[PDB]
Design a protein around this ligand. Structure first.
Ligand SMILES: CCCCCCCCCCCCCCCCCC(=O)OC[C@H](COP(=O)(O)OC[C@H](O)CO)OC(=O)CCCCCCCCCCCCCCC
Ligand SMILES: CCCCCCCCCCCCCCCCCC(=O)OC[C@H](COP(=O)(O)OC[C@H](O)CO)OC(=O)CCCCCCCCCCCCCCC
Ligand SMILES: CCCCCCCCCCCCCCCCCC(=O)OC[C@H](COP(=O)(O)OC[C@H](O)CO)OC(=O)CCCCCCCCCCCCCCC
Ligand SMILES: CCCCCCCCCCCCCCCCCC(=O)OC[C@H](COP(=O)(O)OC[C@H](O)CO)OC(=O)CCCCCCCCCCCCCCC
Ligand SMILES: CC(C)=CCC/C(C)=C/CC/C(C)=C/CC/C(C)=C/CC/C(C)=C/CC/C(C)=C/CC/C(C)=C/CC1=C(C)C(=O)c2ccccc2C1=O
Ligand SMILES: *SC1=C(S)[C@@H]2Nc3c(nc(N)[nH]c3=O)N[C@@H]2O[C@@H]1COP(=O)(O)OP(=O)(O)OC[C@H]1O[C@@H](n2cnc3c(=O)[nH]c(N)nc32)[C@H](O)[C@@H]1O
Ligand SMILES: Nc1nc2c(c(=O)[nH]1)N[C@H]1C(S)=C(S)[C@@H](COP(=O)(O)OP(=O)(O)OC[C@H]3O[C@@H](n4cnc5c(=O)[nH]c(N)nc54)[C@H](O)[C@@H]3O)O[C@H]1N2
Ligand SMILES: CCCCCCCCCCCCCC(=O)O
Ligand SMILES: CCCCCCCCCCCCCC(=O)O
Ligand SMILES: CCCCCCCCCCC(=O)O
Ligand SMILES: CCCCCCCCCCC(=O)O
Ligand SMILES: CCCCCCCCCCC(=O)O
Ligand SMILES: CCCCCCCCCCC(=O)O
Ligand code: SF4
Ligand code: SF4
Ligand code: SF4
Ligand code: SF4
Ligand code: SF4
Ligand code: SF4
Ligand code: FES
Ligand SMILES: [Mo+4]
Ligand SMILES: [S]
Lengths: 118, 975, 57, 61, 197
């Protein structure tokens, strides 16, 4: 044999590569046969229970749902409520609680003493 | 003995010296961060504080004196351990959830979880030093370095590369390479000890970096703010520690950790290979590994990129016209089967010769020899052992009768004296050299290195003497004569287990000390003092690699070495004996399973009626009475037309055999050629059909290393593409040849060979599970023989025989071939580098072959560095770059085999081989010195490990740390 | 799912659970009504006061 | 009839087993035809509403 | 096992296989039990959650009535299964023949149904072995052979046996195939050895 280096790779066309990868996906499905059956049963039971149709109404008329949500929420009361909830979270974060654990323990002891009085 | 009381309960003491070993055996939850079983007490983390005799002291180094009181749940010892770990965490950021080393084995994480700590008294402080990513394999993160010193102790004491020290004198102590040289520019062998022994992710492989887990691939610019967020958010370490344990479980699914044995050299180091799909993330050694434990080299721990290399042959290749067409498996199998049947039924099976790879598992070589004998009917089989271990094995037969090493590498360490001759153990069998250097630096063992070159071990040897090319026989037999003549020889051993002492002495009559002084060009004083040392040494371990066995008289001097130990009386003694350095990972295994043509599996000669009858009964096909021809003589037979077809697997013999012009002519002369290599090797270029091999990571088998250990592998990867493990390919080929083999998994092959092989009688796959390994010979009960010749020799009388041998004249060409070039191998690169070159890091460390030339010869011939020079021999003509170093002396120069092009040394060597085994004399080469280019790029870059200057120190030198004023001992800190 | 919903409603239908959810919604509404912009200095003062109180050994 | 014990299992190759299991999965799809239609409509309405593209931006960048 | 109110005396078939959260390992189930013990204050809410978990089991657990095949007492009981394996054999008080009464066979002997030795395919005697043949080809072979020995030596030389272990429909089909199809009267069962006298 003489010296030959170049490699003539086999001509796997798009059809053959697609078939090979689809066969790989089918084999992966085969390995998880029970899982696929369980997920199909998942969808079936959700659709029977109306959960899937409920989400279908949610995402088909989603513009109407968002419109209803914003038109009900746009009242100043709801915006103030959400703003004050965020502010309460921020302030509770600002409050230092490392020193507050002994205070909580003392409050526990005090409540125990108070309820101890019959 | 040495009664003790621990935890208020009486307990007994064992051979263990320190309290920490007893506590570990007692399962006492004592924090041990800086302690590693292989490393020994490093004493740098102070988290092992226990109350010995009431006083707080480090249990890692507290001697287990009799009658001491041990307590570990006391508030005092708990506070001391907490303070020590707080000091540790002051140097460790501890971002376990997004840290690659949190695969659940990280000692800081485990120990922190064990102590149930929640706060660090000293907050983490980043060291001013940046991460050192200069190395292409592993990085060092001084920010995450806890200064435990395990990496330094590994690089200084258990691997003895000595590239790592710790600058305790610095304001912020850190690990420094050489004199704080960046890692790449330093003398770091890249062995991987520091990465393996690091507790934290301080010294961790770049393969893991950003690839281990799921949340650790996040970019640093967006990972560091998350780490700071979690630092400022969580109040107790327990909850985020549990989250990090969940992230460890996360990693467990994607990270596959399978045990394997390194393919490169014959030490056969076993380690887990932590992978994520197809890429190799880490090579993690385990303490339970028999051959190495934690020891590893650059190849086995960072050289596995060849498995995922795109050059890998995924499909069978068929020589179509003037090209290699990527053909289907079935059509290639039919073609090879039909051609083999044609040349078998036309000119007979005797004209068929097949070669197994010494790099393949035992099942592979057994399948080669079965296909040759139980299928084809020929006996023409060989491996690299014809070039590597044929004369050593022949000498072992001639004197001791058993091939392979006398014992394990642990017995090598236990030796008082190691007699290494012609071995570049530092650069060829790295882990064994680490063991020897560890025993020399720590245990005080003195070694005698005898080779022409001055490698790392030669400059670190007790007595390094450089004899003439192939002159090992002369000075060796003179030393044996002096030992046996002055009474220092073990006469009791000679009368007990040796035969023909007086005949050998008669053979030693012409040999005198002055004779050896004249022949070897070595002064008398060195010879007499090394002979005195050998006589005085209680245990002697003699290692002889290709520097001595690859010669015209290589077999003769191998017998000479073996009978030298025989005269000294080291066989059978624990810790001493002959350990021929088996080169390939499974060259010992291939030779065990009938690779050599003159012997069958079980190390039994073919010309024996009983073994032939047994193999006929098991196989059903008659055995060829005619012994097969040797591998080297195959080319000459081809040039005479005797041989026509080759089936060489995993052996690039068209480039590694002597006079590769001759093998090229034979290759162009023969009709049919089938090769089986993972890569398109040089031999793979000349082949009528190329079969795509599979690397040992993607196949399961048994590797027999130098210590005659059969360690079972595991299938780390599914084979790349649709290529198959070589045993599967051989099964398919034989079935297409009407063999009828049915082996679903190589366990059936292993057990069949075990039944056939008397030496392998006991090795089975259920006895080789995990890291368990058996050393052949093994009996049917399953009890192996860690030490050879322990009670009796294999010979019928039970006593070995001294073989009378003399100095066989080396086939130096003479005349104009003045400069005697020497051929060998580099530490980082493996032969021509069909595997290491595919790894980018090793290529960066060593890009191209170089000719190491002596400074003395650089003056008379006027040669410089980075110069392209020409070497011409009656068999070849190479153009190799030049390197200036003092490793070689005088005319003799070193030409490593780390190139596969026109610069490969194998052009220069000739078709002159040993008389006993026809092993080519690669070390016997001479050429010219032609100067082509005066000024050019130096082949050895500054980032090569040979350019650095290691700092030799014993241990982490903790005493420097203790002298620091800022350092405070937790035991007296709690007080 | 019908059985799960039945169990959930039959356990929840007790007046205690309905009162609990109603009062949770009312608490959210009242906390929204409470203005917290002025409450941040009060929180800072409470922090300082708790620090001073725990400072007394 | 004589005494015979060994069983010659039919040689179902990989292709036949794959076809059988794919047919089983297809039958499971058939049993949940309405469910599969509802889930496909789920994806369609989510993609039209931009929820699916919103998540595509979330997980691509 | 049947009469125990609690899970004190319960079949190992149910153990770790009945529900979804009960297959959790004991080393990691007991800490969860302790957590829930220390977390919930009133039994009502976690009782409702357990009722939801009972509804959980109801989907995966198939409880169908059957009659034991082994002996002639004909004890009837529900067989609580999870897919193909048999988890429990639960007798019911409404069972006529036994009520709650059961033996070892009928209440723990049903592993033969899921046994791997079970013949899943028709077997045809090919040469000296049993080849796993298709249903249709085996049916054609048996039908053709029976027609051959029916139209050659007459139906009187044909004799078929029904199992006393099979349902009434099975034995009726045997005797109909013998008389309403083949035309022979050679039929029997174990009753010839058992209940004929
Ligand atoms: C550890 C568990 C984690 C779970 C973690 C679970 C995570 C997944 C979410 C589950 C709940 C989805 C929303 C369900 C309510 C919205 C949809 C709805 O309203 O749909 C009506 C339908 C009425 O059914 P019908 O058949 O009468 O009507 C059918 C047709 O509407 C007309 O034909 O609702 C159902 O089907 C009930 C569905 C399941 C509800 C579960 C509620 C509790 C979940 C948490 C506790 C679980 C504990 C499990 C363990 C004890
Ligand atoms: C990006 C940003 C990510 C930020 C981190 C998010 C997660 C924080 C950890 C989870 C919450 C931790 C705080 C907490 O929660 O508490 C605080 C307190 C502090 O420790 P202390 O010093 O006060 O006390 C010590 C104890 O006594 C003994 O640990 O407790 C702990 O952190 C204990 C944690 C226990 C495990 C986690 C919580 C489990 C809850 C039940 C799950 C059931 C599942 C089924
Ligand atoms: C018991 C119920 C449990 C439900 C349980 C439901 C559990 C599932 C989650 C639902 C919400 C997903 C996020 C939706 C917001 C983020 C995506 C978004 O912003 O997307 C914009 C788009 C604008 O639409 P446009 O067509 O204008 O724009 C189209 C293109 O963007 C431009 O071409 O938003 C929509 O489509 C609205 C989607 C549905 C929102 C529902 C909000 C309330 C959900 C809870 C209450 C449900 C009560 C149901 C029962 C009464
Ligand atoms: C792993 C770890 C898992 C830990 C357990 C998690 C779940 C705990 C149970 C759910 C919360 C229970 C607490 C609670 O929530 O409250 C406490 C209080 C105590 O009992 P009390 O003795 O104080 O009073 C008794 C009453 O008067 C009469 O039961 O109430 C109850 O537990 C009543 C529970 C009612 C059902 C559960 C809540 C339903 C909420 C509405 C859902 C609507 C869906 C549509
Ligand atoms: C109304 C509406 C629809 C609004 C839409 C818009 C809106 C407001 C959306 C919400 C946006 C918010 C608030 C998102 C936050 C929640 C989400 C989705 C988070 C996901 C993002 C990620 C990746 C979070 C990080 C999760 C995670 C587990 C990180 C690892 C934590 C780290 C880095 C730990 C490092 C670490 C440190 C620092 C220790 O100290 C330590 C000590 C001892 C042991 C271990 C550790 C350890 O691991
Ligand atoms: S065999 C073999 C194989 S297989 C494998 N090859 C290998 C290895 N490591 C690496 N990193 N790359 C590889 O390709 N290890 C394994 O090595 C096995 C042989 O290795 P040696 O130890 O024999 O290696 P070298 O040939 O590099 O070094 C041999 C030294 O012998 C000395 N020498 C040369 N001529 C000599 C002579 O006439 N007399 C004596 N006494 N010594 C001689 C030189 O010093 C060489 O360094
Ligand atoms: N001048 C000179 N020449 C020498 C020597 C010398 O000292 N000097 N030494 C001689 C000796 S001892 C030896 S070992 C030879 C080295 O020669 P060989 O033993 O042939 O070794 P390499 O070429 O390193 O490896 C051979 C091929 O094995 C393939 N391979 C790797 N792993 C596997 C596997 O798992 N399965 C299969 N089927 N193939 C695999 C690789 O692609 C590589 O191309 O060199 C010999 N030639
Ligand atoms: C496949 C089964 C899919 C189960 C139903 C998916 C619910 C999708 C929830 C929409 C909210 C979201 O995705 O952000
Ligand atoms: C099938 C339909 C899938 C509905 C959309 C899936 C939303 C995925 C939500 C991502 C968050 C997560 O899975 O943790
Ligand atoms: C959610 C997982 C969807 C996987 C869909 C795979 C379909 C493959 C169909 C085929 O293989 O022809
Ligand atoms: C004469 C006035 C008597 C006042 C008693 C007040 C209550 C004392 C007991 C308090 C308690 O333990 O409940
Ligand atoms: C004579 C009365 C002495 C009362 C002391 C009260 C406490 C004073 C210190 C308070 C503190 O800093 O803890
Ligand atoms: C989510 C459920 C995915 C199920 C996908 C099944 C694909 C089967 C395609 C085929 O049967 O050829
Ligand atoms: S080195 Fe260990 S302790 Fe430190 S972050 Fe990584 S896993 Fe956690
Ligand atoms: S030689 Fe390199 S890899 Fe080995 S311990 Fe030293 S620095 Fe680490
Ligand atoms: S780099 Fe070395 S000294 Fe630093 S923590 Fe890691 S093992 Fe210890
Ligand atoms: S010393 Fe040899 S066997 Fe061990 S890891 Fe390195 S290359 Fe592999
Ligand atoms: S179902 Fe509940 S009450 Fe009955 S036995 Fe089990 S744990 Fe006890
Ligand atoms: S349950 Fe027992 S007693 Fe009742 S019919 Fe079955 S085998 Fe007979
Ligand atoms: S193990 Fe002793 S100080 Fe670390
Ligand atoms: Mo070799
Ligand atoms: S070799």
């Amino acid at each position: 044999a003489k010296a030959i280096k170049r490699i003539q790779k086999i001509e796997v066309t798009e059809e053959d590569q697609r078939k090979r990868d689809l066969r790989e996906i089918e084999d992966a499905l085969i390995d998880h046969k029970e899982a696929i059956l369980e997920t199909l049963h998942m969808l079936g039971h959700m659709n029977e229970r109306g959960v899937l149709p409920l989400l279908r109404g949610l995402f088909g008329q989603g513009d109407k749902v968002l419109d209803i949500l914003v038109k009900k929420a746009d009242t100043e009361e709801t915006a103030n409520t959400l703003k004050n909830l965020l502010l309460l979270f921020g302030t509770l974060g600002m409050l230092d609680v490392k020193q507050l654990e002994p205070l909580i323990l003392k409050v526990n002891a005090g409540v125990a003493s108070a309820v101890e009085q019959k | 003995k040495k009664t003790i009381t621990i935890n208020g309960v009486e307990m007994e003491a064992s051979e263990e010296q320190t309290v920490l070993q007893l506590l570990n055996n007692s399962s006492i939850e004592v924090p041990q961060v800086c302690y590693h079983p292989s490393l020994g007490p490093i004493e740098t983390c102070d988290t092992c504080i226990v109350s010995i005799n009431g006083e707080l002291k480090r249990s890692c180094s507290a001697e287990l004196k009799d009658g001491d009181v041990i307590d570990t749940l006391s508030p005092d010892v708990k506070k001391a351990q907490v303070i020590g770990m707080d000091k540790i965490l002051y140097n460790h950021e501890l971002y376990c959830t997004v840290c690659d080393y949190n695969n659940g084995g990280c000692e800081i994480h485990n120990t922190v979880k064990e102590m149930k700590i929640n706060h660090q008294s000293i907050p983490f402080d980043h060291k001013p030093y940046h991460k050192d990513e200069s190395h292409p394999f592993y990085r060092y993160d001084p920010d995450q370095c806890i200064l435990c010193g395990r990496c330094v102790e590994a690089c200084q004491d258990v691997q003895v590369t000595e590239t790592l020290t710790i600058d305790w004198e610095r304001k912020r102590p850190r690990v420094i390479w050489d004199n704080d040289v960046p890692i790449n520019e330093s003398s770091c062998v890249s062995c991987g000890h520091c990465s393996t022994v690091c507790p934290c992710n301080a010294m961790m492989e770049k393969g893991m970096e950003g690839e281990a887990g799921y949340l650790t691939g996040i970019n640093n610019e967006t990972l560091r703010p998350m780490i700071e967020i979690t630092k400022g958010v969580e109040t107790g370490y327990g909850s985020i520690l549990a989250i990090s344990d969940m992230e460890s479980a996360m990693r467990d699914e994607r990270i596959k950790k399978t045990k394997t044995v390194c393919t490169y050299c014959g030490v056969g180091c076993s380690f887990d290979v932590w992978t994520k799909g197809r890429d190799i993330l880490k090579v993690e050694p385990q303490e339970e590994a028999p051959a190495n434990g934690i020891s590893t080299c650059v190849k086995g721990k960072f050289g596995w990129d060849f498995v995922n290399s795109e050059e890998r042959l995924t499909k069978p290749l068929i020589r179509e016209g003037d090209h290699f067409r990527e053909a289907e498996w079935e059509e290639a199998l039919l073609l090879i089967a039909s051609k083999f049947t044609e040349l078998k039924e036309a000119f007979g099976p005797d004209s068929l010769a097949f070669i197994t790879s010494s790099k393949c598992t035992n099942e592979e070589s057994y399948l080669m020899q079965k296909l040759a004998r139980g299928v084809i009917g020929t006996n023409n089989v060989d491996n690299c052992s014809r070039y590597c271990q044929s004369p050593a094995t022949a000498g072992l037969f001639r004197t001791v009768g058993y091939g392979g090493d006398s014992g394990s590498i642990t017995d090598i360490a236990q030796a008082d004296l190691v007699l290494i001759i012609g071995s570049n153990t530092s650069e060829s069998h790295p882990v064994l050299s680490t063991r020897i250097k560890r025993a020399h630096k720590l245990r005080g063992q003195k070694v005698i290195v005898a080779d022409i070159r001055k490698h790392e071990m030669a400059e670190r040897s007790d007595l390094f003497v450089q004899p003439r090319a192939g002159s090992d026989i002369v000075w060796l037999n003179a030393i044996a004569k002096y030992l046996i003549e002055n009474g220092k020889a073990d006469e009791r051993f000679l009368r007990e287990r040796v035969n023909g002492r007086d005949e050998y002495v008669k053979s030693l009559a012409p040999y005198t000390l002055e004779y050896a002084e004249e022949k070897t060009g070595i002064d008398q004083e060195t010879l007499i003092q090394m002979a005195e040392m050998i006589g005085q040494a209680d245990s002697v371990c003699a290692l002889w690699a290709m520097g001595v066995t690859q010669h015209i008289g290589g077999s003769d001097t191998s017998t000479a070495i073996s009978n030298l130990l025989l005269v000294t009386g080291n066989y059978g003694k624990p810790g001493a004996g002959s350990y021929p350095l088996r080169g390939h990972n499974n060259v010992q295994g291939a030779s065990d399973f009938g690779s050599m043509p003159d012997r069958l599996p079980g190390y039994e000669k073919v010309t024996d009626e009983q073994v032939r009858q047994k193999y006929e009964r098991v196989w059903g096909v008659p055995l060829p009475k005619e012994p097969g021809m040797t591998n080297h003589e195959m080319i000459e037979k081809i040039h005479s037309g005797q041989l026509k077809a080759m089936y060489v697997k995993g052996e690039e013999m068209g480039l590694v055999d002597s006079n590769i012009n001759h093998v090229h002519a034979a290759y162009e002369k023969l009709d049919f050629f089938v090769v089986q290599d993972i890569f398109l090797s040089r031999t793979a270029e000349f082949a009528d059909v190329v079969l795509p091999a599979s690397p040992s990571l993607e196949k399961e088998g048994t590797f027999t290393n130098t210590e005659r250990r059969i360690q079972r592998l595991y299938q780390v990867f599914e084979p790349l593409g649709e290529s198959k493990p070589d045993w599967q390919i051989i099964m398919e080929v034989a079935n297409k040849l009407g063999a009828g083999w049915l082996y679903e998994h190589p366990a059936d092959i292993m057990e069949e060979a075990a039944k056939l092989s008397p030496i392998y009688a006991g090795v089975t796959y259920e006895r080789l599970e995990g890291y368990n390994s058996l050393q052949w010979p093994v009996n049917a009960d399953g009890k192996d023989s860690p030490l050879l010749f322990t009670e009796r020799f294999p010979f019928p009388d039970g006593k070995a025989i001294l073989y009378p041998v003399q100095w066989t004249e080396p086939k130096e060409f003479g005349e104009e071939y003045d400069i005697h070039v020497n051929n060998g191998r580099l530490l980082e690169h493996f032969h021509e580098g069909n595997l290491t070159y595919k790894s980018k890091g090793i290529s960066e460390k060593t890009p191209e072959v170089f000719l190491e030339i002596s400074p003395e010869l650089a003056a008379e011939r006027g040669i410089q560095d980075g110069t392209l020079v020409r070497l011409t021999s009656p068999f070849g003509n190479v153009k190799v770059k030049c390197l200036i170093t003092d490793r070689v002396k005088g005319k003799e120069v070193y030409l490593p085999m780390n190139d596969s092009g026109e610069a490969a040394i194998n052009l220069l060597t000739g078709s002159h081989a040993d008389k006993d085994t026809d092993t080519p004399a690669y070390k016997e080469t001479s050429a010219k010195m032609e100067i082509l280019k005066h000024d050019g790029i130096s082949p050895l870059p500054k980032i090569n490990h040979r350019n650095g200057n290691p700092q030799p120190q014993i241990g982490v030198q903790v005493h420097k740390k203790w002298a620091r004023k800022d350092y405070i001992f937790p035991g007296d800190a709690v007080k």
